[model samples]
Target: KETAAAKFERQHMDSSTSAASSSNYCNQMMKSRNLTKDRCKPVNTFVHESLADVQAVCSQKNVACKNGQTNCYQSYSTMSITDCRETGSSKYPNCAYKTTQANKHIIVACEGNPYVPVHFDASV
Candidate 1:
């Protein structure tokens, strides 16, 4: 079984993937990357920054998690990321995503012994 960290790496991490010109980037990636499993993920983010830099966010300022916990951290540097959002009329067995690339500081929730990001909270 894949650990949470490994799963995050497979689904979200793509250091060398530069920004894309086509808006349908997510439409292809979401399904091809196996993110469209039992159902659509509605929204997801893929960071195009180095793994080390993304992992370094653990030591950044602790912020509030979406669950109201205080285990979130934000990266200081703006990173290249592709935001994938499910489009309306997206039906099961046929998930569709709209891709948008932008540079933003990411917020994430950390946990476990090494304190790696467990959940991508958002970007700001």
Candidate 2:
């Protein structure tokens, strides 16, 4: 079994080396949502690498070596969103628009490992 930090490192390394395009991966993770306040928020997306990739990396590094046996496990990542809001409105005297934030979790599977890495960006 690999720790969260270890899995993140491996996934980042693979993303840099793999032929798969990071731009495309990033694009795939992008999403948009309409808030209750009638505002549109742009959310960054992430690529959750496959489990197979994690397993292979672990085996190669001997991080999970057990009698020369190893297996890939499942993992997940997320893309978070944040925005500022106004506090106290005239229409709704009791209503206060506070800073808002949210997150979306994405499931990814590596090509050869059981570990998944989630990469995301923020829209300013």
Candidate 3:
């Protein structure tokens, strides 16, 4: 299995467009690469972890999602944390946290997506 760093390097190195959207780049990479297993899994994990970090920061700062909208939050003191509460819903839940002997990370899942084993450092 590839490492998360390796996967990120590969994805970015293989792409030509500098500012191409992540979804588009990921789709193209998926088509070009031979992903015998869940190749894009690492990227998904990255997104999950980043989003969770944002949410945690928001929670720590006591930032409230505007109008209970849950999509964005305002920080009173500092913008150290991010609020992703707006993205949360009955369908798409908040990120799940996990810690490993090697590394710790978070996993976020959409309502209808398949459940995949998440590793903090592993790729796919």
Candidate 4:
């Protein structure tokens, strides 16, 4: 079983890819990361930042998660990110996505003693 924090890293962390060259990044990354399973994820995001830096977000300013959880935190600094939104025609087993890049302050929910990001809330 994968921990939520680990899953967050697998789903969101991408410190290497360049935004300019990531037009098709979502199509490949989402599939490779195992996000497209029985059905396509409606929308997803990938952060272009280091693992350590992302983890430190657990110690950032406290905020509320979209689901109303109080364990969420917002990053003090903005970071590069890529948003992957499913296209209207996307279907199961062969999902399609539109990539959008931006630099913004990200929000994430955290847990555990070592405290790390478990879920991505949103960006601002």
Candidate 5:
């Protein structure tokens, strides 16, 4: 089974992408990364930063989690991120996405030993 931390890395972090400026980045990436499996991921954000920098948020400002778990953290500064939104025309097994790039502080959930991020809670 894929660990939560590893799953977050696969679904969100992608330093290899040259630019989030690409118009079709979200659409193409969602499909290429296996995120568009049985159904489209309604909303997702990918961070274009180093894993260390993102993981460091675990020790940063503490916040509340959507599920009320209380293990959430927010980034100290705005970072490059690409938001993927499922289009209206999107249907199961055939995903379509709207890509928008921006610099924003992201919220994440971390747990377990070493205490690295496991869930991408939200972006703000």
Candidate 6:
């Protein structure tokens, strides 16, 4: 089984490429990354930063997660990111997405011995 940290990396980290200008960037990436398997994901965000940079967030100041958990941390610096939102016409197995590019501080939830990020909370 893939660890949560590794899964987070696979689903969100995109250090090598930034396809913000592409109209179908979200559609292509969601499919290629296996995020559109059985159903369309409502929303997802990809961070165009190094894994090390993201991992370091775990050591930063903690904050409340979306669900009110206390294990989330926010980044000190703004990072390049692309938000993928399922379009209104999207259907299952044929996920459609709208991509919005921005530079924002990322928030993620961390756990385990190494205190690594396991879930993306938000970007502000």
**Best-matching candidate per lDDT:** 6
TM-score for each model: 0.85, 0.18, 0.21, 0.86, 0.86, 0.87
Model 2 vs truth, CA RMSD = 18.3
What is the full ranking by lDDT, best candidate first? 6, 4, 5, 1, 2, 3
Better of 3 and 4 by lDDT: 4
Question: In candidate 5, what residue range of length 10 has the lowest lDDT sum?
Answer: 14-23
How many pairs collide in each candidate, listed in order?
A: 0, 16, 3, 0, 0, 0
Model 2: lowest-lDDT 10 consecutive positions: 27-36
Cα deviation in Å at residue 57, candidate 1? Answer: 0.8
Deviation from native of the Cα of residue 70 in model 3, angstroms:
36
> Would you list the clashing residue pairs of candidate 6?
none
- Model 1 TM-score is 0.85
Candidate 6, residues 5-54, lDDT tens digits: the string is: 88998899898875476878899889988999988888999999888898
Candidate 5 per-residue lDDT over residues 1-124, each given as its tens digit: 9989899998999877534977789888898778897678899889988898889989898999999989999999988899999889999887888888888998999886776899999999
Decoy 5 TM-score against native: 0.86
Using TM-score as the yardstick, the better of models 2 and 3 is: 3
Give RMSD to native, each candidate.
9.9, 18.3, 17.2, 9.8, 9.8, 9.8
Candidate closer to the true structure by TM-score (higher is better), 1 or 3: 1
- Runs of candidate 6 with Cα error greater than 4 angstroms are 114-124
Candidate 6 at 6: error in angstroms? 1.3
Off by over 4 Å in 2: 1-24, 30-50, 62-124
Error of 2 at 20 (Å): 4.1
- Using lDDT as the yardstick, the better of models 4 and 6 is 6
Q: For model 2, what is the error of residue 15's alpha carbon versus the real structure, in angstroms, after optimal superposition? A: 11
